[PDB]
Amino acid sequence: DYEDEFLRYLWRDYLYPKQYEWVLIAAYVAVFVVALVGNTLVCLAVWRNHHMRTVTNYFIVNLSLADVLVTAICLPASLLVDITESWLFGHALCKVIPYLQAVSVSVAVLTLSFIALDRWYAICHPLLFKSTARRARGSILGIWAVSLAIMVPQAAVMECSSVLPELANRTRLFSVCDERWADDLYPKIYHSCFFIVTYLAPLGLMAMAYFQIFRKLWGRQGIDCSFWNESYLTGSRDERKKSLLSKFGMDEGVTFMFIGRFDRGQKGVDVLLKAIEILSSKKEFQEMRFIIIGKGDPELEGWARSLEEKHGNVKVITEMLSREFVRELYGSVDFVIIPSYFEPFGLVALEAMCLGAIPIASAVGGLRDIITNETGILVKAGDPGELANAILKALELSRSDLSKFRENCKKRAMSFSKQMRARRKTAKMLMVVLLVFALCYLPISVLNILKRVFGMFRQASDREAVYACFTFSHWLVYANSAANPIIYNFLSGKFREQFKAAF
Ligand SMILES: Cc1ccc(-n2nccn2)c(C(=O)N2CCN(c3nc4cc(Cl)ccc4o3)CC[C@H]2C)c1
């Protein structure tokens, strides 16, 4: 009958001294200061400098401000509650602080989502990529609006109660803050939807987005620009060409060069050979030199050697060469032909371009991205005829200086390589941030979903370790706020620079 009543009456002053408290305090103040100075350093770094004012960094600022909010208001309250098992604040703050916590979690997740979306467009759909500062500073406002709108039920249900309800004796030592619902459907529904909205759906979506992003960035680390440059070549280019041609027993002429596996339906050496057969006539053919380098199918090798013994301006190399010598080739020949069928990386285009070799390549895959206007010739893949015509145009261009074209090739290759490297680094950082986020909010979510929907931890002496789980989960949640600036400091060069300069 009056068991809970009487037991509460007897044990109401039984404080149980927790063995590990000073470590919790130390952890909380550590996280507190680190999150504060870290996130403020983020905000300062971005706001002050102009090169930092990027959409990604505007969002990162939004995230940092969210974390600042949480760290300032909710972290100390969470510390006090978790240590003293009591609510030491007003009835108003009992609604406000958990509300601000929910809202800020929302803001954080949505921010990461917009980061992921922005990067997903920039990388996976470059053509549709629209991302001005006006969009960001206006989308952030939408994030805060929705976040401040959909969290009002939690503010509503937050109540500050103490002694067991329906009890005449309102005597108490301490009060506590918790949720008060009517129908038991309401808390289950709201908390399941809270887990879904603030964790499940956006982290799923972002998992997809970063999956596609990393799939698009995979294997694209760029090339060694320190190796692939003309600096290690001696003399003038035309004299290197003259030396090269005379070394193969040929005379001066507009030199084209293929390098790749002799494949049927990949590197397209067959397209090249066919194109040479097309060029076997015409007046222009004698003005051309061809150097076909590679090794693959015996049929294609024979097909090449036949041309090497038919036309005096065609040399075939099935010999194994060194990178230094390949470099020397790229810095000697006039044009390099990449008749690929689906070339996803086009490292030959980059490596050759860095050495002034002008690319004549099939408009497929990576090549399309690398070779733009005023920096190469692009061909419908597969068609030997259009390739031959491209070679003819190359010849008609060779009756001019071509030097600025080559310098354009160099610049394009270098900027492209640097861009893909920067891209890689950025995506890596954002990935790590998302990951650390997920791991940080995982325990509190598994606990909340196990406490508010699928039963609870309310029965008997099944509470002592559960409190410890909850305190740890809370601390972790706040530790994320300290984590992000550190992540930025290890994985973003510009943030490193600004974090150093701030001292
Ligand atoms: C302390 C803390 C930290 C993070 C939390 N989180 N889990 C998921 C998202 N974020 C929670 C938590 O379990 N939340 C979020 C909001 N809630 C809440 N209660 C709080 C009490 C204090 Cl002292 C300070 C902040 C508080 O936020 C009550 C509802 C419930 C869903 C609690």
Swiss-Prot record:
Signal peptide: none
Required for response to orexin-A: region residues: 1-16
Residues that coordinate or bind suvorexant: N448
GO molecular function: G protein-coupled receptor activity; orexin receptor activity; peptide hormone binding
One GO cellular component term noted in the UniProt record for this chain: synapse
Domain of life from the UniProt record: Eukaryota
Membrane topology: Multi-pass membrane protein
UniProt entry keywords in alphabetical sequence: Cell membrane, Disulfide bond, G-protein coupled receptor, Glycoprotein, Membrane, Receptor, Transducer, Transmembrane, Transmembrane helix
Disulfide bonds: C94-C177
Annotated glycan sites: N169
Residue ranges that the UniProt entry lists as topological domain Cytoplasmic: 43-57, 116-135
Localization per record: Cell membrane
Transmembrane regions: 22-42, 58-80, 95-115, 136-157, 189-210, 429-451, 467-490
Record's function text: Moderately selective excitatory receptor for orexin-A and, with a lower affinity, for orexin-B neuropeptide. Triggers an increase in cytoplasmic Ca(2+) levels in response to orexin-A binding.
Further remarks about this protein from its record: The antagonists suvorexant and SB-674042 bind at the cognate neuropeptide binding site that is situated between the transmembrane helices and accessible from the extracellular side of the membrane.
Family to which this protein belongs: Belongs to the G-protein coupled receptor 1 family.
Domain remark text: The N-terminal region is required for orexin signaling.
Protein name stated in the entry: Orexin/Hypocretin receptor type 1
Origin species: Homo sapiens
Upper lineage: Eukaryota, Metazoa, Chordata, Craniata, Vertebrata
Residues of the full protein shown: 26 to 373 of 425
